[PDB]
């Protein structure tokens, strides 16, 4: 055989290649090292994420690289399109997808920056994944809640609260009108608040608030822990206590343990709220990393019942157009491409259940019209600070947010323009709800910059 180094593009750049319906397709925004032609940079990514290395090897001739190699089949602007054959991937394993597509290729000297914008998951591979165990429609049925966004909120302070105090705040929130409450992503089991103590007291609060209000309630008990066995143990205790929900930080825990917990959740009849803690480490910058829409596809494939999607108008960054695309990728059965939203491929979901978007972070009553306009009914709106920061405490704060959502929904259904009349609708509702007026006055000057 012919030993020696060859340019990657000789084997792994093929602009004549026609992607197959079974191919997994990636859109990489590539910044080559100065002096490296784009075609060689793209071929290096294709080679070193599929079958190739830096020099020719005799063992290449023991297999059919025409069948197994990835190929950059199109370069447009700074975006390289790369097709990966079906047989390269382990069925049902997001971990394996990551190990190929983002394993080593982001650290090559020849490619100074690399960002995965999108990924076309082919149906043949998609259906080796189960998707969410519950889904939007079944979850609404389990809750008996129809025709409005659902209300939640993170208990605050993030850390430092005892289990008993933690449950008191939960009780006040839920009995005041929130449908749900949740552990902070970083609240797991700690000296000031051990998880068994929290789980027990919180579920007493959930049951009491449910009986007193007459509406079904939940609390997203965080099972996130240092090992998979510990997370599974905390999920079992949540189910023994009759909780409708558990919560998992699917990126900090990681996808292998995430898949374990999603399997156990369905076995136990639990709905699985997924927090995206750590995602901004990967997806903040537009020149290097992985955009959240890719993480969101992987999330729905494994089968989270909800995932946070951003608020656009809140304290954390989130572009309106990109967020609308993410919501579609999470909720719809088929999503056409639209690079204006960063969707470089269409995505078919072939019957996998839809995921509830969850909008959280720095939002209060004044944001409700925009949030309803962005997400429609099928979303959770979470008010943590926006509940407990009410001048009269968590119960009054919960009532204020619940009334705000219902008022905006009512007005929309009547035919009013909730964007042009958003503020007027809230002011009308405040005439009958002092808690809402107090929230509106407290936070009337609190805004964050927005990006379309």
């Amino acid at each position: 055989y012919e030993a020696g180094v060859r340019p990657y593009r000789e084997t792994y750049y093929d602009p004549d290649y026609e992607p197959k319906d079974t191919d997994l397709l990636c859109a990489f925004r590539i910044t080559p090292k100065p002096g490296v032609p784009m075609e060689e940079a793209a071929a290096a990514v294709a080679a070193e994420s599929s079958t190739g290395t830096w020099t020719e090897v005799w063992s290449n001739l023991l297999t059919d690289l025409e069948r197994y190699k990835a190929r950059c089949y199109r370069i447009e602007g700074d975006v390289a399109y790369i097709a990966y054959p079906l047989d390269l991937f382990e069925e049902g394993s997001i971990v394996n997808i990551m190990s190929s597509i983002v394993g080593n290729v982001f650290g090559f000297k020849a490619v100074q920056a690399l960002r995965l914008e999108d990924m076309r998951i082919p149906v043949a591979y998609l259906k080796t994944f189960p998707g969410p165990p519950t889904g939007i429609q079944v979850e609404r049925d389990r809750l008996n809640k129809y025709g409005r966004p659902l209300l939640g909120g993170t208990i605050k302070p993030k850390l430092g609260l005892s289990a008993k105090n933690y449950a008191r705040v939960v009780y006040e929130c839920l009995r005041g009108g929130l449908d749900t409450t949740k552990d902070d992503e970083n609240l797991n089991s700690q000296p000031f608040n051990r998880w068994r103590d929290r789980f027990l007291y919180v579920m007493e609060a959930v049951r009491k608030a449910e009986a007193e209000t007459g509406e079904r309630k939940g609390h997203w008990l965080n099972v996130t822990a240092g090992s998979t066995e510990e997370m599974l143990k905390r999920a079992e205790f949540a189910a023994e206590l009759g909780s409708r929900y558990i919560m998992v930080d699917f990126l900090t825990a990681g996808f292998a343990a995430f898949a374990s917990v999603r399997r156990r959740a369905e076995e136990l009849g639990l709905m699985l709220h997924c927090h995206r803690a750590m995602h901004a480490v990967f997806d903040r910058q537009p020149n290097h990393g992985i955009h959240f829409r890719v993480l969101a596809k992987w999330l729905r494939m494994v089968g989270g019942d909800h995932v946070h999607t951003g608020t656009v108008v809140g304290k954390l960054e989130g572009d309106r157009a990109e967020t609308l695309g993410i919501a579609d990728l999470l909720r719809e059965d088929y999503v056409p491409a639209d690079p204006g939203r960063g969707l470089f491929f269409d995505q078919d979901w072939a019957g996998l259940k839809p995921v509830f978007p969850v909008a959280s972070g720095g939002i209060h009553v004044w944001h409700v019209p925009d949030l309803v306009s962005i997400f429609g009914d099928d979303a959770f709106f979470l008010f943590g600070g926006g509940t407990h920061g009410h001048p009269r405490g968590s119960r009054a704060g919960a009532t204020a947010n619940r009334v705000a959502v219902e008022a905006v929904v009512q007005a929309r259904n009547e035919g009013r323009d909730i964007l042009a009349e958003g503020r007027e609708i809230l002011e009308e509702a405040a005439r009958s709800c002092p808690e809402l007026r107090e929230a509106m006055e407290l936070w009337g000057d609190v805004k964050f910059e927005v990006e379309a």
């Binding site: 939007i136 429609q137 609404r140 049925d141 008996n144 809640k145 129809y146 025709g147 409005r148 009108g177 449910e210 009986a211 209000t213 007459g214 509406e215 079904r216 009914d377 009532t399 619940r402 009334v403 219902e406 008022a407 929904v409 009512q410 259904n413 009547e414 035919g415 509702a429 009958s432 709800c433």
Partner: protein, 105 residues
């Protein structure tokens, strides 16, 4: 006793109820009426007031059934349902009538 969607707003007038029924019909969804004296988290199946109104064409037809149900069961909570057979999910459910004792505690 709260009753889910709109129960944190003031009780709806007949005009406000009719606008919600119009919203159901405008979107091609199926309006229904249910009633019970045992509202609460453990009751998923209220009593049907007739079958869902698959053939309802105007909101006034539905309001007439609401009046009929309200007059026959003055001691019951009565809710309007809206069903979307495409998603096979309820798309709007709210209570339109509460018994007298609800408001005099």
């Amino acid at each position: 006793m709260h009753t889910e969607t709109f129960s944190y707003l003031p009780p709806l007038t007949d005009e406000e109820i009719k606008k919600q029924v119009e919203y159901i019909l405008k979107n091609g969804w199926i309006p229904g009426i249910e009633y019970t004296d045992e509202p609460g988290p453990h009751n998923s199946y209220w009593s049907f007031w007739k079958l869902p109104f698959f053939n309802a064409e105007t909101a006034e037809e539905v309001m007439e059934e609401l009046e009929a149900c309200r007059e026959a069961n003055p001691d019951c909570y009565i809710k309007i349902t809206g069903y979307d057979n495409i998603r096979q999910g309820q798309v709007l459910s709210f209570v339109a009538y509460r018994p007298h004792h609800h408001h005099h505690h």
